[PDB]
Amino acid sequence: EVQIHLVREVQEVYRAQGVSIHDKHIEVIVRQMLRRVTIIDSGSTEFLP
Amino acid sequence: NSVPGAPNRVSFAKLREPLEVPGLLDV
Amino acid sequence: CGLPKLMALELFKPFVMKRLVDLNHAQNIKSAKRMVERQRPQVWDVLEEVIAEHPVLLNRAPTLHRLGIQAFEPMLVEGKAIQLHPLVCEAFNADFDGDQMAVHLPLSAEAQAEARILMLSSNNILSPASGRPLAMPRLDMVTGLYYLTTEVPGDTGEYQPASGDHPETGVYSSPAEAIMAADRGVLSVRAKIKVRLTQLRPPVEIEAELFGHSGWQPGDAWMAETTLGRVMFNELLPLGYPFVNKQMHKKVQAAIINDLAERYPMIVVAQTVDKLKDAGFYWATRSGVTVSMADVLVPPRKKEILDHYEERADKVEKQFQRGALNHDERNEALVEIWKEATDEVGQALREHYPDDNPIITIVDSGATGNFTQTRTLAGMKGLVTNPKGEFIPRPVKSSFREGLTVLEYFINTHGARKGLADTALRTADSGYLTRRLVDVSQDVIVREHDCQTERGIVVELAERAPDGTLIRDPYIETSAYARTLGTDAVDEAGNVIVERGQDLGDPEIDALLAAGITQVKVRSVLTCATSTGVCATCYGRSMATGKLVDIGEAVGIVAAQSIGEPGTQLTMRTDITGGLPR
Amino acid sequence: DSEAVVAVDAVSFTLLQDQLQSVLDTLSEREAGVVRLRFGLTDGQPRTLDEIGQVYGVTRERIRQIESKTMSKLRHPSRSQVLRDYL
Amino acid sequence: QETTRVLTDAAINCRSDKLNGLKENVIIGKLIPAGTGINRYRNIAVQPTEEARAAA
Amino acid sequence: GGYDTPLGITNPPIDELLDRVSSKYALVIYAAKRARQINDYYNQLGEGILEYVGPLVEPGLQEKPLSIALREIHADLLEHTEG
Amino acid sequence: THKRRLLALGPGGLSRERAGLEVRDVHPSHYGRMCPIETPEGPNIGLIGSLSVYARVNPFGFIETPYRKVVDGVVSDEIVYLTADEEDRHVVAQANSPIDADGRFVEPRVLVRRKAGEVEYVPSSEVDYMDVSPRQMVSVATAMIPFLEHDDANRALMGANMQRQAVPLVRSEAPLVGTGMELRAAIDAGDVVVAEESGVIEEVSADYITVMHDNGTRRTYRMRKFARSNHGTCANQCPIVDAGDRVEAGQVIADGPCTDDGEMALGKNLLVAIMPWEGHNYEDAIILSNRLVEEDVLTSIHIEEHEIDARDTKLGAEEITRDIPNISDEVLADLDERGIVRIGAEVRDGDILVGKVTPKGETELTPEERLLRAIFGEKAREVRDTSLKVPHGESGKVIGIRVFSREDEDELPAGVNELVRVYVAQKRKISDGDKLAGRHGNKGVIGKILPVEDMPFLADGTPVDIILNTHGVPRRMNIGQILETHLGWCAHSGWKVDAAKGVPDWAARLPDELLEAQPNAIVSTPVFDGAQEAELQGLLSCTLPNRDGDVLVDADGKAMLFDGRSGEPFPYPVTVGYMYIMKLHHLVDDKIHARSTGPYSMITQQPLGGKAQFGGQRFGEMECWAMQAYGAAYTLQELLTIKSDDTVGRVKVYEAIVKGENIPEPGIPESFKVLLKELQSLCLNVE
Amino acid sequence: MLISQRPTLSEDVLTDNRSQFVIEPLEPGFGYTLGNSLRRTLLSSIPGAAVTSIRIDGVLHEFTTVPGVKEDVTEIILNLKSLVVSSEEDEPVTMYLRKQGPGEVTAGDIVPPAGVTVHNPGMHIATLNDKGKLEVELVVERGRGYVPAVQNRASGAEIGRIPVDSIYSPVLKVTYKVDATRVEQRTDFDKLILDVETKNSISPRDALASAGKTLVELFGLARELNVEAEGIEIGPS
Amino acid sequence: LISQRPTLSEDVLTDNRSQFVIEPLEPGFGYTLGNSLRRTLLSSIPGAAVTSIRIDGVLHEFTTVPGVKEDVTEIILNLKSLVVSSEEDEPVTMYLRKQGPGEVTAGDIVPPAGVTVHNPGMHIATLNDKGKLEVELVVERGRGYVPAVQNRASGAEIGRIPVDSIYSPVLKVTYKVDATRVEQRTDFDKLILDVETKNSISPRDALASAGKTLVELFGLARELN
Ligand SMILES: [Mg+2]
Ligand SMILES: [Zn+2]
């Protein structure tokens, strides 16, 4: 739900100025935001929590 | 006129200001 | 693109040195360099021989987005200024108040091929951002086409069915005969006439009613109660294109070039846009758009509106003065009062102006400006912001044609310098945001043609109504258009409307809203499965081609430039940030 | 940086080397050999007349005669017209 | 950004660059791996269809 | 076939070109390698005959080799393989 | 305006990196003490301002402002200068208020300025200070804008900036429509020779005016003929008085660079038309007639200085001499017997100005060069020529050569023998690309200089001179240029308001001796005591015919413009009129630039930067992102390796282009190796 | 003074009655000086012929339709206006066409008197139905230019004197533009690209020669003031 | 229909300007005809102007002359206002010498055979006691406008100053048509062309040279056959 929230949130600004950006230009950025994950369990493999 | 060799430039001014423009390099 | 010869002689100096050695104009290349550096008049003919079919890259600094560098075949032009095509000025965002454009030069065969194929101007018409064309006509030629395509009732030599002692005397056997009757002072260009076209494609209505099965137009004939000007304008558009019979607002020209770029190949769009520029200029001179002080009319009932709102204001001032409401409440009340006064003054102005006024013509055609600039010209400047941001409750009540007074000018300067410094800082901050975004998303390049995934987001796509109607969502073209369908589209256990993996442009959306299902699960770069960059079916149609994106495209930098480019056009606000720092 | 390559002198010098090699190839084998060994075209170290006569089996004075003849030959405009413009 | 701070912990970890991004190949003068620099296009062989060589 | 006659750098029409290749990047490297082969042929023309062949279509009066390459593409006269 | 300028960035002042945007903003204690219109338009908005017209500085450094105190509705003449706190003590009303010339504000509720900046209609008794005038808030350069009260503040800002960038032409005609602030601003600028004491002119010349004071003594005012200014322009001073006139103490005696009969004159008056003509005047572009080129209407003189020295070295000393090694004789025809060119020689780009040679030393020679010297008999010629060549794109005559010598006992620096300066001057006519602007920020380059035949002419056959654009007027909000244009046509053709059936209605507020005016009479609308659009409307109905009975311009202000190109009349009448436009100092010949191969930088091997050297354009990061966004990888590889830093690759590209071979494969750029050596020097093992 | 560069002229036959003429090079800027004059002399100067009034029975005052036939009155009018016919009789001659029974009317169903000659007999004008009958009395005259509908100078009782516009000009559509051939060495010489489209009465090159003749007579007017005045000579050819 | 061949009748208004009225043309033709004659008249009438001057006391253009009131570029701008009709295409040289106090008129130029200065009332410069003005003037034929023909391309010496020249004896041309356009279709323009010359040639000669140029160019379109 965050990328569906965040795409609406940026496009709320550009629609206010009447400027059209297609959503696939914003969805690429939010794809690059949510890549990583935090570590809560190392299991037994090398990941500092 | 206020300057003795001025060309006559006929003005549209409706007012009449008392203080003439100072010696602009005074600062 | 034009090129000054005194600069192209210094660009192409090794090419021209080899070429003038090969014609034996100099013995060795040392004497060739001497001949160039003393500019002997063989070298201009050799440079003309050398330049032809060898593109050059033109950059206007700064390069905000992808269309800030565009390649052009040069041609030699005297003088010392780079002559530039009038349609790429929006693409560069270049005016002619002294802007300087850098000229680079490709050398290799690969570099010349890239400038000939990729970066040529005619192959870059649409936006990378939203697919609307940037080579669309603008400020001057839009007014030209608007005057050329408008229709004036009661014009010169109209069609009137004047049965009774004579026929109608408005029909014309040919556009050529109408052209002769227009050149002689009989026909006006914009009078409604009944021509007999044989060389234009009719609209779908008349094509269905007359032929339907085979409406091939080079042969047959038909009649069309249009103006002359719409015929003269539709002659610019290609042969397969139907008749338009409209009034060329800038919206309608954008829609025509959008459809024409979507359907026809790229060379036809380039030639048609060129023809539109030429006809637009030639009919922009004859339109008679001039600005005089007699062409700026203050509304005659302005004193009534300002007197009534002064009487509205002084009661609030009295109640604050002898202590009913406090300072913040009286400032809010006066702000409300003068906003009502401003809207009333602008309404009186808009109903007052006749539609052939050049100022309201420029405003209403879509050429330039909005109505607030006319309301500040004649009418009322309105409220002015403080250095803090609050509105001065006085406010300026004078129109610029009537000429401001001293204190009203001194109030206005606050808002003007505030907005101008805001534009400077906003340009710097948008440069920062574009750089940071490009540095983030540079890894995203289209590597696989298809990830063959099965996930994908759902688009709203025209939610319902209380009457059961599928009212169209306003922001479809920025969200749903040009995306490949991740799932199918079936309705009420009927047949499938759109199968999986369709580009989903306009007619599939028309079929979707006809069949009446709103949400579709479309594919996206959010749910793509390839690790090294996104696939190609998830990214969908690239806006700058009209076709599906290629297997090597750099979609990350295109996306980041498209986000951070219009940040210069982002107002701050009218806490919650609502501008560029939002 | 005046110490850097002027980048037209390099292609000029290579073209000068080509034109000079053509003009030397107008000569005979003994003449071009004597000229190249006299001016050090092959190695950068120009050997003198006694070493040239030693590699040619003859006197240094015969080599001086040959060098005088070739410098007379080269001074003709038939060879000089495409070399005068290189200075 | 933070050219000091990014550099030093890369140097501590002995982190090896892979030269497969986009800002890397711009720096080192190699072809970028996007557009006309990927190996789908950069290894194109072009041969003239010997029926056309039969014409010449 | 309603397109007007192209002129200068836009001949051959790029949309008639792009039916031959997949994407325009393939078209660029196609034209570039043919232009390098043609320029090699012009530099191996005066010396002895070697493996470099071309130009197949009739060259212009003084044509760039890249333009002869692109017209050779448009003539359907070359074959190629990607990577 | 470069004096009397307030600056806000220095030692202890605010730097730009620490600049707060609050200091950028004006606020109502600048009224009279600073000018909100005039400021730089780049990134230094609001920091650099300008003083007002009437401002004054207290002995502590606070900025005074003169006000007329009013005692109980009687506006006095005790012009009391006031600082900001004392302005906040009292209330201040405005000069454009109804006054019966007995004090006695007619309206009781008067506009006024409170302390915090409020504007209230206080009853007309508590008012204790009036302004001295209108236009007190404005600077000097903005007070020369006519119809200021109709412009937006952005375009008035641009007009006030670009009025400071005009170049002085060769004719310099005074403007038709102006303000009052031209004569005073010229005689106070110091670039007009002013007669100190009254008397009779004994003798004029082009070099001197010897005046004769009334008590015996004479005095010669020497001229300043063709001086080069600090930015390379003209500085001529022709005298305007005659051989037997009388002058008074303070009379203008010599018009300077941008003057005409004393008053300021930055441009010329030009017939203008506001139609969009054939797309050449698109997006602020301006087309011109050829009459400006033919009649030298817009022609600036630009005087450039060149200089070279002769200093000593370890190998001896440099030698200015006519003999130059490895040089021909047709280039040595301009030179005299001892170096420098003769005064009056027309030089081109790349010609010898000062023949100056240095001792070079002794280097080994390449064997090819050695045998060519053996073939053509030329010696080693141990001196190396580094002469002063006039650089690229500069030409024109040679005005004067000032040579300073160590042997002539002059003040040269240490170890320098002969210093010699050469002043080359040209006559830059107008051309396309040259920046032009009116006085309202309506700037723009010259689109195309049309021939005089295919230019729209009136019914009189007068062709217009420039053609502006329509769409630049409304959306920029400066119809001050339109009002100036209408008033320019009125002052050009002259008028005579017929007061035969009484004085008409609009003319009653209008002063006397303006109801009739001769053609080409100069008028002046001041900044805020302006022209009153109703009165201007009444003027344009009542102008007088040209030579025949022929009224070219109707009451609205539009003439029936025929077309010069095709020949049919334009189907709607078009606003024409007379306009003042200046030649701005952004000409093309200063701005054009190109480089195929020039110098290179020292540490990294990049090409240089700027028109002074050759230099190439900065292919920065955003250009790189655009080239990546096209997908053009090969062109980016060329631009970043074999046009800047692949140091073998540069000469390989040059050799392969000249020989006609393929462009070779690029290698590793030098700036990357420099980065690699830096990281290696920072004790980071970078393998 | 000599021209210093002789302007040439060379056609380009697109169709049988449509040719693109160029004239290059010209002095700056002469392309508009002569091309606009050549356009107006192409249109409003070549004497041809057209129909002016058509007398058709059946139609008396109801100008809508003709009984028996398919197409209405106005379609027959704007078909007959585009009827190329060449005429030598300077007075307005009158022509007839008549047909009985159902079937299409060609233009060749007309019959001319002496002197008048139709150039496209295989042109459809009308279609007769249900044993309908057509009788249109044409009035063919020769004129210049393109006159509009001449109003009824005759009486109202001459009901088939209802007028049409009369496209007298044998040319139909003349467009042109200038160019900028070789601006460097020649210093901006102009090239005039004419484009003339005629009806098939005369050829476009005959149209251009006749317009050159009438224009050179119209300017021989101004030449016959001081014939011994120094103009600009082109020279030989 | 109507043939009624057009005619060109003359009407002298003043000495230098005169009206030429042409009638009766085809309708919608008079504007084009008058424009074509105006564009030729205003551009391509051959004349003569002073191409280059030579003052003894100067060496270049941007200096002063010792004693005269103006300077050399002002004397250049004044001499550019001259009007002089040469008769032969070789460049003749007139002379202008003046010493002593007195304003120098244009009448003081002594012209050689052929040439004639057409207005003595031009203020060239003005002098005094120490002033002495001596200046050569080269008058050359030509047509249209030329810019400054350079001192580098010509082989002239240092003392030669090149001037711009405007070889144009015409001064101001307009027209106004009288479109009859009556309801009887006997319609005809009536072009009243108006030539003003700069006192060098008569307007009869101006219109005759314009007609000669147009007859020469339009017969090219008459000579495709
Ligand atoms: Mg700009
Ligand atoms: Zn995918």
Side-chain angles (χ1 to χ4, degrees), chain I residues 97-124:
Chain I
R97 318 170 164 269
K98 189 87 167 192
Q99 204 266 132
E103 150 201 1
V104 167
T105 78
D108 299 15
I109 288 179
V110 45
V115 279
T116 172
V117 178
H118 266 280
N119 42 355
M122 179 163 329
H123 190 290
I124 287 174

Coordinates of all heavy atoms in Angstrom, one line a residue, chain I residues 97-124:
Chain I
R97 N 38.9 71.4 -51.0 CA 39.9 72.2 -50.2 C 39.2 73.4 -49.6 O 38.5 74.1 -50.3 CB 41.1 72.6 -51.1 CG 41.5 71.6 -52.0 CD 42.6 72.2 -53.0 NE 43.3 71.1 -53.6 CZ 44.4 70.6 -53.2 NH1 45.0 71.0 -52.1 NH2 45.0 69.6 -53.8
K98 N 39.5 73.6 -48.4 CA 39.0 74.8 -47.7 C 39.9 75.2 -46.6 O 40.3 74.4 -45.7 CB 37.6 74.7 -47.2 CG 37.0 76.0 -46.7 CD 36.3 76.7 -47.9 CE 35.4 77.8 -47.4 NZ 34.6 78.3 -48.4
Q99 N 40.3 76.5 -46.5 CA 41.1 77.0 -45.5 C 40.3 78.2 -44.9 O 39.5 78.8 -45.5 CB 42.5 77.5 -46.0 CG 43.6 77.5 -44.9 CD 43.7 78.9 -44.3 OE1 43.7 79.1 -43.1 NE2 43.7 79.9 -45.2
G100 N 40.7 78.5 -43.6 CA 40.1 79.7 -43.0 C 38.8 79.5 -42.4 O 38.2 78.5 -42.5
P101 N 38.3 80.5 -41.6 CA 37.1 80.4 -40.9 C 35.9 80.4 -41.9 O 35.9 81.1 -42.9 CB 37.0 81.6 -40.0 CG 37.9 82.6 -40.7 CD 39.0 81.8 -41.3
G102 N 34.9 79.6 -41.6 CA 33.8 79.4 -42.5 C 33.2 78.0 -42.5 O 34.0 77.1 -42.5
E103 N 31.9 77.9 -42.5 CA 31.3 76.5 -42.5 C 31.5 76.0 -43.9 O 31.3 76.7 -44.9 CB 29.9 76.6 -42.2 CG 29.0 75.6 -42.8 CD 27.5 76.0 -42.8 OE1 27.2 77.1 -42.4 OE2 26.7 75.2 -43.3
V104 N 32.0 74.7 -44.0 CA 32.2 74.1 -45.3 C 30.9 73.6 -45.8 O 30.2 72.8 -45.2 CB 33.2 73.0 -45.2 CG1 33.2 72.2 -46.5 CG2 34.6 73.6 -45.0
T105 N 30.5 74.1 -47.0 CA 29.3 73.6 -47.6 C 29.6 72.4 -48.6 O 30.8 72.1 -48.8 CB 28.6 74.7 -48.4 OG1 29.2 74.9 -49.6 CG2 28.5 76.0 -47.6
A106 N 28.6 71.9 -49.2 CA 28.9 70.9 -50.3 C 29.1 71.5 -51.6 O 29.6 70.9 -52.5 CB 27.7 69.9 -50.4
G107 N 28.8 72.8 -51.7 CA 29.1 73.5 -53.0 C 30.6 73.7 -53.2 O 31.0 74.0 -54.4
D108 N 31.4 73.7 -52.2 CA 32.8 74.0 -52.4 C 33.6 72.8 -53.0 O 34.8 73.0 -53.3 CB 33.5 74.3 -51.0 CG 32.8 75.5 -50.4 OD1 31.7 75.9 -50.8 OD2 33.4 76.1 -49.4
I109 N 33.0 71.6 -53.1 CA 33.6 70.6 -53.9 C 33.7 70.9 -55.3 O 32.7 71.3 -55.9 CB 32.8 69.3 -53.7 CG1 33.0 68.7 -52.3 CG2 33.3 68.2 -54.7 CD1 32.3 67.5 -52.0
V110 N 34.9 70.9 -55.9 CA 35.1 71.0 -57.3 C 34.9 69.6 -58.0 O 35.6 68.7 -57.6 CB 36.4 71.7 -57.7 CG1 37.6 71.1 -56.9 CG2 36.6 71.5 -59.2
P111 N 33.9 69.4 -58.8 CA 33.8 68.1 -59.4 C 34.4 68.1 -60.8 O 34.4 69.1 -61.5 CB 32.2 67.9 -59.5 CG 31.7 69.3 -59.6 CD 32.7 70.3 -59.0
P112 N 35.0 67.0 -61.2 CA 35.4 66.8 -62.6 C 34.3 66.6 -63.6 O 33.1 66.8 -63.2 CB 36.3 65.6 -62.5 CG 36.7 65.4 -61.1 CD 35.5 65.9 -60.4
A113 N 34.7 66.3 -64.8 CA 33.7 66.1 -65.9 C 32.8 64.9 -65.6 O 33.2 63.9 -65.0 CB 34.4 65.9 -67.2
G114 N 31.5 65.0 -65.9 CA 30.6 64.0 -65.7 C 29.8 64.2 -64.4 O 28.6 64.4 -64.4
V115 N 30.5 64.1 -63.3 CA 29.8 64.2 -62.0 C 29.3 65.6 -61.7 O 29.7 66.6 -62.3 CB 30.8 63.8 -60.9 CG1 30.9 62.3 -60.8 CG2 32.2 64.3 -61.2
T116 N 28.3 65.6 -60.8 CA 27.8 66.9 -60.3 C 27.1 66.7 -58.9 O 26.3 65.8 -58.8 CB 26.8 67.5 -61.3 OG1 26.1 68.6 -60.7 CG2 25.7 66.5 -61.8
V117 N 27.5 67.5 -58.0 CA 26.9 67.5 -56.7 C 25.6 68.2 -56.7 O 25.5 69.3 -57.2 CB 27.9 68.1 -55.6 CG1 27.3 68.1 -54.3 CG2 29.2 67.4 -55.6
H118 N 24.6 67.6 -56.2 CA 23.2 68.1 -56.4 C 22.6 68.9 -55.3 O 21.5 69.3 -55.5 CB 22.3 66.9 -56.8 CG 22.2 66.6 -58.2 ND1 21.4 67.4 -59.0 CD2 22.9 65.8 -59.0 CE1 21.5 66.9 -60.3 NE2 22.4 66.0 -60.3
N119 N 23.3 69.2 -54.2 CA 22.8 70.1 -53.3 C 24.0 70.9 -52.6 O 24.7 70.3 -51.8 CB 21.9 69.5 -52.2 CG 22.5 68.2 -51.7 OD1 23.5 67.7 -52.2 ND2 21.8 67.6 -50.7
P120 N 24.2 72.2 -52.9 CA 25.2 72.9 -52.2 C 24.9 73.2 -50.7 O 25.9 73.5 -50.0 CB 25.3 74.2 -53.0 CG 24.6 74.0 -54.2 CD 23.5 73.0 -53.9
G121 N 23.7 73.0 -50.3 CA 23.3 73.3 -48.9 C 23.5 72.2 -47.9 O 22.6 72.0 -47.1
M122 N 24.6 71.5 -48.0 CA 24.8 70.4 -47.0 C 26.0 70.9 -46.1 O 27.0 71.4 -46.5 CB 25.2 69.1 -47.6 CG 25.6 68.0 -46.7 SD 25.5 66.4 -47.4 CE 24.3 66.6 -48.7
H123 N 25.7 70.8 -44.8 CA 26.8 71.1 -43.8 C 27.7 70.0 -43.7 O 27.5 69.0 -43.0 CB 26.2 71.4 -42.5 CG 27.1 72.0 -41.5 ND1 28.1 71.3 -40.9 CD2 27.2 73.2 -40.9 CE1 28.8 72.1 -40.1 NE2 28.2 73.3 -40.0
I124 N 28.8 70.1 -44.5 CA 29.9 69.0 -44.4 C 30.6 69.1 -43.0 O 30.7 68.2 -42.3 CB 30.8 69.1 -45.6 CG1 30.1 68.6 -46.8 CG2 32.0 68.2 -45.3 CD1 31.0 68.8 -48.0

